[PDB]
Amino acid sequence: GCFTSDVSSYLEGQAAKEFIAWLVKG
Amino acid sequence: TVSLWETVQKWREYRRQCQRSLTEDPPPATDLFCNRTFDEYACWPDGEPGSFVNVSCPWYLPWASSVPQGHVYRFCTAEGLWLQKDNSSLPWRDLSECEE
């Protein structure tokens, strides 16, 4: 979690997780 | 990592399989069962009165392989009604085994 690609990979992973959290509260 | 679009595609297939199940599964032995439903997250079968209903963690989850033996739970009351959460219109649900 120290390099640019760690942030961009984290950002991409969050898109899917927010979608799950939307399904859950929904 | 698992992308949003791959998760959306898997979720659509899960929903489509659930809707087939809801429409085509034979009816229960009595209307005293709690009624099958899709809550946007998991597919729920008919529930026996007065027992917990468990469903495998939805297979479209990005971290699905992190929880391959997990279950999400509902409770079907003796009245044939899904147990509800007070202060909301939603049925009680335990998804803790399917968390990331």
UniProtKB/Swiss-Prot annotation, chain A:
The modification Phosphoserine is found at S5, S8. It comes from the Eukaryota. This is Glucagon-like peptide 1(7-36). It comes from Homo sapiens (Human). The chain holds residues 101 to 126 of 180 of the full protein.
Swiss-Prot record, chain B:
Keywords: ADP-ribosylation, Cell membrane, Disulfide bond, G-protein coupled receptor, Glycoprotein, Membrane, Receptor, Signal, Transducer, Transmembrane, Transmembrane helix. Its main location: membrane. N-glycosylation enhances cell surface expression and lengthens receptor half-life by preventing degradation in the ER. Residues 1-100 are extracellular. It is found in: Cell membrane. The record marks R93, E100 as: Interaction with the endogenous ligand GLP-1. May form homodimers and heterodimers with GIPR. Belongs to the G-protein coupled receptor 2 family. Selective recognition of glucagon-like peptide over glucagon is determined by residues located at the C-terminal end of the glucagon-like peptide. This is Glucagon-like peptide 1 receptor. It comes from Homo sapiens.
